[PDB]
Design a protein around this ligand. Sequence first.
Ligand SMILES: [NH3+]CCc1ccccc1
Ligand SMILES: [NH3+]CCc1ccccc1
Ligand SMILES: [Cu+2]
Ligand SMILES: [Cu+2]
Ligand code: NA
Ligand code: NA
Lengths: 620, 620
Amino acid sequence: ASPFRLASAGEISEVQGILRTAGLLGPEKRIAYLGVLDPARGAGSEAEDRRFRVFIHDVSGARPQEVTVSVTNGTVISAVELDTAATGELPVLEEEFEVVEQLLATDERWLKALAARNLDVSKVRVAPLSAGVFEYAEERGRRILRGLAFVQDFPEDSAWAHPVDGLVAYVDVVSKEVTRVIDTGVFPVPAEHGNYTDPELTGPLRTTQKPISITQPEGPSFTVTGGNHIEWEKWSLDVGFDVREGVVLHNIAFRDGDRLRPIINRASIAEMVVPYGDPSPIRSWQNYFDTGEYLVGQYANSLELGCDCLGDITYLSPVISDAFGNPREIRNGICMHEEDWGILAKHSDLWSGINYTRRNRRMVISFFTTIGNYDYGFYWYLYLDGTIEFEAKATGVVFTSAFPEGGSDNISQLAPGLGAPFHQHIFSARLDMAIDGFTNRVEEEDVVRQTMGPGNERGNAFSRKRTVLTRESEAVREADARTGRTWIISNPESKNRLNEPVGYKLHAHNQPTLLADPGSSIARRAAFATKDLWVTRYADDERYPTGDFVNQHSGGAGLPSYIAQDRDIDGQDIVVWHTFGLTHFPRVEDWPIMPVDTVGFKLRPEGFFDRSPVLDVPAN
Amino acid sequence: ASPFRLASAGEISEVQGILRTAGLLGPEKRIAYLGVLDPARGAGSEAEDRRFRVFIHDVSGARPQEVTVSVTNGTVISAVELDTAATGELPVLEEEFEVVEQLLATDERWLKALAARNLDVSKVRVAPLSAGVFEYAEERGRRILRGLAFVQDFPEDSAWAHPVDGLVAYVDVVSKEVTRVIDTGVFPVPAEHGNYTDPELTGPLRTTQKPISITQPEGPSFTVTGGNHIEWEKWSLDVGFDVREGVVLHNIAFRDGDRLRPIINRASIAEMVVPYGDPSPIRSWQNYFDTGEYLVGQYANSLELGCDCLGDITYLSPVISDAFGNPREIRNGICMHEEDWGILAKHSDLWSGINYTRRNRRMVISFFTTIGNYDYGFYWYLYLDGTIEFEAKATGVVFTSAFPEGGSDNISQLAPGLGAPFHQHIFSARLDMAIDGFTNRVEEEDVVRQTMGPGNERGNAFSRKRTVLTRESEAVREADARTGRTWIISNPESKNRLNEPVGYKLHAHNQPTLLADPGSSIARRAAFATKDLWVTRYADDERYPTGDFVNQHSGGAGLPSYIAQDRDIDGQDIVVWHTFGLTHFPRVEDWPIMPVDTVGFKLRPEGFFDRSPVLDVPAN
Ligand SMILES: [NH3+]CCc1ccccc1
Ligand SMILES: [NH3+]CCc1ccccc1
Ligand SMILES: [Cu+2]
Ligand SMILES: [Cu+2]
Ligand code: NA
Ligand code: NA
């Protein structure tokens, strides 16, 4: 019944029927993105109109289209031819992954470079990498992928252990044309294998680990209704899924007594970028927007009970469209469970004799995606005390190169002859805020040090200051760990019992932001990543911090174009965009498969409640 | 058999016998600290000499003594009269807590102030607070506590809800003399109660929480031998306990193949300080060194199964001395268990078809202590992948005051009329390092941004630089979150298979350090807290960053005096001291009992191993 319900296979089949009938789904067409649109502001007209947005690619070289469709009214709402030289290319198609290796396999320049290295072309895997926008004028308006080669010694070999350095090719995947092959020199292909299931590398497996059994004999404390509506420990929300963004959280609210109090209207990871810091011409173009270019949701893993998710697990199996409009189920793609989280509150009082201990718990909503060598887990946490936390877990295999003789300032050595270029993994969280409603504002809070003197005779005082961000042009903010800088989202029209505005405080990890030179192509395309915090006024069409068509866009779209409007954000419907990321200098211990590293952020209540909201938690 | 075994009740009884016989334990004497000394460098003489250090107080006003005793040889090794005007007072005695309230109860000035407020003296609790060193010349060489008053409406009432502001007294606990009573004005005593077990405040308890059952059907994966030696998942260590520091970790090592490789020789929280930022004369002197002044280990809680520690718990029950030298068991004072920790490593490979998932786990060693209104949990974590992490969990009841009419820049309002002064909780971790042995060095690692130009034509390159700290005078370091600053402890004489020195990287949280004015008394007494990282050359007598006698010491002892020696630390036996802390602006949600907040640090292997050390972990 809910307008925020997951798309169903039936809805997908209708969209495919509608597109076919209208002549928009010919055998040269491919669906490159399909997703449900969120209800517009003012859904209190309960006239549900389930609408879908579709990007349609044309493998014959015709212009792609953006199409909005109403499943409710069986009609095509709008259909727009796209000039991709202007507004950017469509996302990489899954079927294009193989095409790069196959086209290079018959190219004489490619075969020439492989033969000079005594490599059998049948052993050479080619990674299909997004191209970016650089100096090659012939690429404007064309659908280009770049290829880097790895050797597989046998079909179960890990190809990442055997990079072929000094060699890169550019491919036009529509006209099927290898446009350039660059061979800057021969590097030895690193010889050692990286097969982490080979007993010769693992040694004998441990026998010392004894089982941990986590069970809920009475079932879990949360309920799921309508497919994707969660109620757990006063929290209420809807779990959505989008093929670009992955898990999306809607209508996050907290039942405080009788009132259902909104907190966040929509929470997602709206973009993520991985820039490489190796200046070698073989790799200096390498940056991928896993979310905007590849669509992380469509590579979500099926999560196994007992391995990926442990305990009493409830699964969601989201439905997406394949390239032809058929629905495909991602079986067990979202794991949902509660976890014990230690002590929540504890005190033994000398004067009253009361001994008091309460335990904490958290609700976990997670998925995993795999794009090439990278593997990422996305975790949302809801805690008893009102805290919301996001955590990204990065694992998989690092992207490799040759380690150059005589070393490198921009590459780590992982094994003899084998290197791993320096890089970052940078995320953009989009938080469409709704603290007790839609009239919200953001204050920047800094610790204030005070000088010894009148009024502060012993030199012990310290304070804090808050600065309201009133317009978009002043709402691009940087971290300052040294002054304890945080940001508070409050509702100036909703006060707690002390007559102060209710609020939530955003605590960032204060990791470095984008390191690339501000004049670089990547700094222009990933401008969001150069600052920790942006606040915009809400608008229907401002969904992604990089714009709608990231692949081969020349830059500037998204956040820097939005904030130029300089709209009022002081007590308005606002959106917080938080940049956070990992700077990865690979270590030996990351090889041949990488232990998880993490990054994230959290939001804690700041005078949102009238006292601690967990006074009614019982003893264990 | 191990020299690092916990002190036994029998050893304590011998110490009491030895002291008595020597005339050092008369009925005017009180033991203010008793602890085992660590074996000296060069314990390869296996001539175990179990030695104890004792601080002896004299309630009659005579000079206290420091005494070293050999339980092995039944002899007093040394005994030193202390001039406390010079080297500081002995730690607060537990029996002195009540003495402040009892002495004030008969003082006419005190009774006068209470009667003006219509307070029944029988209802008024007095917190015994350490005094510090300020402007009162008559306090030098005297044992002074300061008292702040709270009202208990009935014996089970939470007194923290009813601070009596505008009133403070100073007390000499040896001569039993109220030296000053200061009454700066009357404030209403806040009326609301803060009784978090009162159904009228909690409302009806939740019935929605269903149980989480954590069990180990085959028992835990770790073994304990010799009372306190742990072996778990290639980790080996000894768990010690000291009445000042609490849980101490000795001989942390990792079994890498056949070799037992040392990592850390001794790890402890060696000091912790809570400075208050309220400039009011009633509280502007308030700072407590919970570790150095009060001794956190002697207030360790007994931890309840299912409430404090959940799962398959192994307990240690450490033995300390009471004020007369009798042994007392802290029943179940240390909890020890392993926890599941999510995904350790995961990859699904497009080219090989291999799907690979492994789960992580961690070994937890924890205790809780309670000093007055504050409650703190200390958690050490050991992970499968070689990571070591410390986490402090802060809870209990916030320290309260009146909220002044017309507001405050240095106090938060928690309830009508009730305030909570701004403060910090700052910890000092002392890491006596032993990365593959005792020849260690520290490098500071900063990210390096590179300019677009020759060699970096696309402006994408970035790098890192490492700076060796060679002498103590250059080994006082500050955080820089903006440049990703970390510190690496390496052994330049031990190389991995890539011929690079083995190392561990320290990742800090980059929270603000001491905020007080550098000319303040607290900045002098807690100088360690003004910088994030100190490195010293190891020395037997350099145990605490504030020195041995913190109570009423005038400042400068500890770290700033140690590093003045300017010793060589480049490939030597070194000690890392890491300052980290929480800056607490109390919120409504912290009242009437505070949800846990956390801070900590972690160390990760940095080319310590020759590849990932968890390749031999099995599938679940
Ligand atoms: N993360 C997307 C880049 C990528 C895509 C496919 C193979 C290897 C790398
Ligand atoms: N943390 C030590 C300060 C303290 C001691 C006893 C009661 C209240 C406060
Ligand atoms: Cu990485
Ligand atoms: Cu605090
Ligand atoms: Na909003
Ligand atoms: Na050392």
